[PDB]
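[step 3/7] fold_predict: job queued, chain A
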Amino acid sequence: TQAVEAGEKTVEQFVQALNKGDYNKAAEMTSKKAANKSALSEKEILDKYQNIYGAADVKGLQISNLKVDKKDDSTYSFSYKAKMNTSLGELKDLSYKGTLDRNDGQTTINWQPNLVFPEMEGNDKVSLTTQEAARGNIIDRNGEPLATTGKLKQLGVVPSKLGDGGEKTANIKAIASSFDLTEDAINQAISQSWVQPDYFVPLKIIDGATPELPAGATIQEVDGRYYPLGEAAAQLIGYVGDITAEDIDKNPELSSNGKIGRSGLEMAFDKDLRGTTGGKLSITDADGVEKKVLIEHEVQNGKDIKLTIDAKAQKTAFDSLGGKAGSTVATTPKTGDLLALASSPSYDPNKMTNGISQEDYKAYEENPEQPFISRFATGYAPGSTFKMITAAIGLDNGTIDPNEVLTINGLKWQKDSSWGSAQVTRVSDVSQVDLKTALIYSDNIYTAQETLKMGEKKFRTGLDKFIFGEDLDLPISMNPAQISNEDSFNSDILLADTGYGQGELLINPIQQAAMYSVFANNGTLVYPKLIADKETKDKKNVIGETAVQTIVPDLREVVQDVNGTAHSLSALGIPLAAKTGTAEIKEKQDVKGKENSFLFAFNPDNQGYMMVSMLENKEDDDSATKRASELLQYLNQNYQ
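[step 4/7] structure written:
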């Protein structure tokens, strides 16, 4: 019992050393090389485990049902079941067995080749054959491709068929002008360490018609990932990169030869898109004659994935931002179908996955506008567009009388002198302001006064009926929206600022479209969905139906009234209910007030589409409303 307990500890420590990959530590626990002891020496056991387990990418060796008995006065027999993860899946139900040696005062393992795999004898060999799985495609709501593996035209040069002295520099200058390349990068590519005289050094991926090939230029077709929309959907779709050795150490079921999604939907759906590797892991004998097949299954290609995105709406929404910092979200508010999730500025996912220079990558990462940000999933202050929600809450709890007219003098206002220099600011000096006037002119002072009159308790009661704190069921990384930092404002100034969409509010554009959908469903919140085959989930009785039939007519006047903030949209001649907004942010960089322009708009007749667009740190005389004419036409003519 005292020695049998020490034998169980030896088997447990040996398996642990194998699980941790330290094969040297495991080999030092074996007995000496003999006929009925260890079969191989310590350094030979190290090399056999490192070769065999390293070939199949063995990971996570764990045992169970351990039993250590006693045979002779110095031999203790052990046995256990075990399982492990390999590059072809999990290898479960393995019956291991062996003998221990209890000479001296420390128990060792009589090592045998059956301790690598159960039925191995002497000089048995292990063979692994694998076939890569094709990565699945990502498609829009109409089957158009958003991410596809296909053939590409790769531009490269062979330094031998170029020329000697002047003929080489002339062709390099000719290839640089025929394919929009710098003459200093062609020389740097052909002068890398890995280059040999007769090698094919790739350069650029041409995504169109190939021009004339100078002396030394050659195109070779290669298979790779391709994104048709390009930068218009780079943040949403993402990109794939080469699989590294570290990736295989974390997940052996990957393909060391394949691609892995690094961000976006390519990464959120990497498992469903990459498929499963097919092949066979067998034990052979001396040569290649198979004895036992351990693992084998056919290769399964990756599943395709269909999104609610519209490929034409995604491109139009992105191009409408003109490369400026901002985001645009388009949905069908009755179902939640995310038609477009645009973010600007953006990066080139094709250049990102087909080899990008450290210079162009640093330009993306050091750009102050930060194109890598998925702005549709980034928490922003909603802006004074948030008046609709505060007004709807005010109508529900009866705080706001739609016909009561407040008297506001000037462009600034504060409750008491206790507010110091904290003041609510508006843009239009309108003396007689009611709810309809406040929504047309986007009057923050009216909203601030109604919020303070409503009180924090009644205001939070209406806010809590939304999606603050909820994690949306979406394959996009994002934090839940919040009302403030803590569960109480503890500040009249913060309460008022929260009223018209400022303060510590944090709501990303997707969450905004979810909350704003109540005006297209008679007070019912419709959760947005990105996967086409998903069921429509909704949240009923968020705001009163009376508040909807009171605010939406006013939102029509935001477009139709000549002094409405979105009156430029009346040029469309389509039924529009809209609401613009602004937000002042005290960021860093300099300290000059950064302003954000917002636009909410949907069809108040058919409720077919809804739009939430915003510009981050807007240039002067720019706005989201100025850039929405094109997308609103498409959504109106195709989503009724």
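[step 5/7] annotate
The longest helix spans residues 2-19.
The domain at 1-131 is CATH 3.10.450.100 (Nuclear Transport Factor 2; Chain: A,).
exit 0
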